[PDB]
């Protein structure tokens, strides 16, 4: 106890509670791009720190502009760029399916 193994401030979680929490986390990411699919889909407006505004319907572009830091959610962001870099179309379809 007086000498602790790992440095103070280390966060450690595991088990079923950890795994279920990752499943619910990805639902928020798929929510931001859900209603941008279809012949009757909408856009989203995002404003960064400096005030510049970006209006876009491209699914891969929206996920880039979000400042996601959740480690499990970042997987869904990367597959968006994967579909972007190979075929270029289907960036939202690969996200809802995930």
């Amino acid at each position: 106890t007086p000498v602790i193994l790992l440095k103070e401030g280390t966060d450690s979680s595991q088990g079923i509670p950890q795994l279920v929490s990752n499943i619910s986390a990805c639902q928020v990411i798929a929510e931001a791009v859900r209603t941008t699919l279809g012949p009757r889909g909408m856009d989203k407006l995002i404003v960064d720190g400096r005030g510049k505004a970006t209006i876009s319907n491209d699914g891969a572009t929206i996920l880039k502009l979000l400042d996601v830091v959740h480690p499990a959610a970042k997987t869904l962001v990367d597959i968006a760029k994967s579909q972007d870099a190979e075929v270029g179309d289907g960036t939202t379809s690969v996200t809802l399916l995930a």
Partner: protein, 529 residues
């Protein structure tokens, strides 16, 4: 109230912020607990069913790993006792390449069992002697457990079966595909004359399709682009320069001086004419592509395009040396027409695109070449890096097989046999060293327990069935993974093997770590800063 006034002697002279532990209670019992905690962290990352683990270092970088040595490097430990185990595991990786988790499980289990022996009346001096004798007795037994042999290390079909087990514990489900790839790359950089060097296998990661579309390229590939207007060559003669592709100047300061009208006008014309002849002289030998390790000039580029010379630039001082080996050419330190001996060859050089990326490919039609490269295609960066670590583990196994050709059964069949035979020897040793010997044999079981725990079955049913079968004389019976009910299986017939040198070093370094910790009696620590 009153206070306890800091008894005199060494306590009153000690600097503030420092610590001083003494005796068995405050030094050895604490160190064993600290070591025990470290084992439980990576214990779940053992075996084919060992679950992945996710680590974020202090630089916000993301790692998803099964490799035990990788986890410890990015985890940062502060207890001195745990650090000793870490340095032991890192040494085993450098010397062998696989078995970085066998050290932690074995060294952790040894210290836990040595706690009770000290608890019932033995001393630290007698425990160490008992451990060391078993370590010597373990090695003498080990050669008797060899059950297979590597026959020909340039046979593609045979080798793929040798590396499959070394990959089965990393990428369960895709072990067949990855085993075939690494076999092709390693078997065709092989030298006749010996000395398989490991650096001669290159890995290039390209984002895109699934992992099944990755392949092997007999040559080298770079993520660059051509400078001139020439793009592809069909039968290339290559010249390699380590100097900038431009007119040279004196290293000492040198200025141009003019005193008359004619010299002012004739300077610019003279310089251009000299450059034209130098490039034409290069093209006279037949070179098709020029590769340089430095800056290129505009006039050289213009004349290179005129004479149909392909020009590339890359400055690594380590990629260029690798390129020299691949084509057989030799470097040049000055812009001179290359000698026919000094020019390499290549069957095709071209610029291609793969998954939104531009690459330059030096492809041989020769099966052997000098070095080979494996192209990785995945859907995420984290997915590639873990596969990259698997390729390293598979290659390092091939490196060992060249050094030694003997295999031993895996899946817990080796450790069970050692525990059975050490105890039989331990029964015939009178004295107080008989207890430590039996404890050493008892620690070997944790490796069959660790596999069984992660498999989702009861450990005691397997261990009981392994002992009963091994008493009948079966030295090749180990744990079965596919069975949802605990069971055993024959390992030699199932082709599950591991290198003899992997076990020989793993046992040696593990015990050396345990006895090193037990020799400590007191700790003096300086304050952090």
């Amino acid at each position: 109230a009153l206070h306890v006034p800091k008894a005199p002697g060494f306590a009153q002279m000690l600097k503030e912020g420092a610590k001083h532990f003494s005796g068995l209670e405050e030094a050895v019992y604490r160190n064993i607990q600290a070591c025990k905690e470290l084992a439980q962290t990576t214990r779940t990352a053992y075996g084919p069913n060992g679950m992945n683990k996710m680590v974020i270092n202090h630089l916000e970088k993301l790692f998803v790993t099964n490799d035990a040595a990788t986890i410890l490097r990015e985890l940062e430990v502060q207890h001195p006792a745990a650090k000793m185990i870490v340095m032991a595991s890192h040494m085993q990786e450098q010397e062998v390449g696989d078995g970085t988790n066998f050290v932690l499980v074995f060294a952790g289990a040894l210290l836990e069992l040595a706690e009770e022996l000290l608890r019932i009346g033995l001393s630290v001096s007698e425990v160490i002697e008992g451990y060391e004798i078993a370590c010597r007795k373990a090695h003498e037994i080990l050669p008797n457990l060899v059950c297979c042999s590597a026959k020909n290390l340039r046979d593609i079909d045979e080798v793929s079966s040798l590396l499959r087990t070394s990959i089965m514990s990393k990428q369960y489900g895709n072990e067949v595909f990855l085993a075939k790839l690494i076999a092709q790359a390693c078997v065709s950089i092989f030298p006749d004359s010996g000395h398989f060097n490991v650096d001669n296998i290159r890995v290039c990661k390209i984002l895109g399709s699934g992992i099944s579309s990755s392949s092997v390229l007999h040559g080298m590939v770079f993520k660059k682009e051509t400078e001139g207007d020439v793009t592809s060559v069909k039968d290339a003669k290559i010249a390699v320069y380590s100097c900038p592709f431009d007119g040279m100047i004196t290293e000492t300061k040198g200025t141009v001086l003019i005193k008359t009208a004619e010299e002012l006008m004739n300077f610019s014309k003279g310089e251009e004419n000299l450059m034209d002849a130098q490039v034409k002289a290069i093209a006279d030998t037949g070179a098709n592509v020029v590769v340089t390790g430095g800056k290129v000039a505009d006039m050289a580029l213009h004349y290179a395009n005129k004479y149909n010379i392909m020009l590339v630039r890359l400055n690594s001082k380590w990629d260029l040396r690798r390129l020299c080996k691949t084509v057989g050419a030799t470097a040049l330190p000055r812009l001179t027409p290359p000698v026919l001996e000094e020019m390499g060859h290549c069957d095709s050089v071209y610029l291609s695109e793969v998954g939104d990326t531009q690459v330059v490919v030096f492809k041989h039609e020769k099966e052997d070449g000098a070095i080979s490269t494996i192209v990785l295609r995945g859907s995420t960066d984290n997915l590639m890096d873990d596969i990259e670590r698997a390729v390293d583990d598979g290659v390092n196994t091939f490196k060992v097989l060249t050094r030694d050709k003997r295999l031993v059964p895996g899946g817990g069949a080796t450790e069970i046999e050692l525990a059975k035979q050490i105890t039989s020897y331990g029964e015939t040793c009178p004295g107080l060293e008989q207890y430590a010997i039996k404890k050493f044999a008892e620690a070997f079981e944790a490796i069959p327990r660790a596999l069984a725990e992660n498999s989702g079955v009861k450990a005691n049913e397997v261990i009981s069935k392994l002992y009963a079968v091994h008493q009948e004389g079966n030295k090749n019976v180990g744990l079965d993974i596919e069975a949802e009910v605990p069971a055993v299986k024959d390992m030699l017939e199932a082709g599950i093997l591991d290198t003899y040198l992997g076990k020989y070093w793993a046992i040696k370094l593990a015990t050396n770590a345990a006895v090193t910790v037990l020799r400590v009696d007191q700790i003096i620590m300086a304050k952090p800063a």
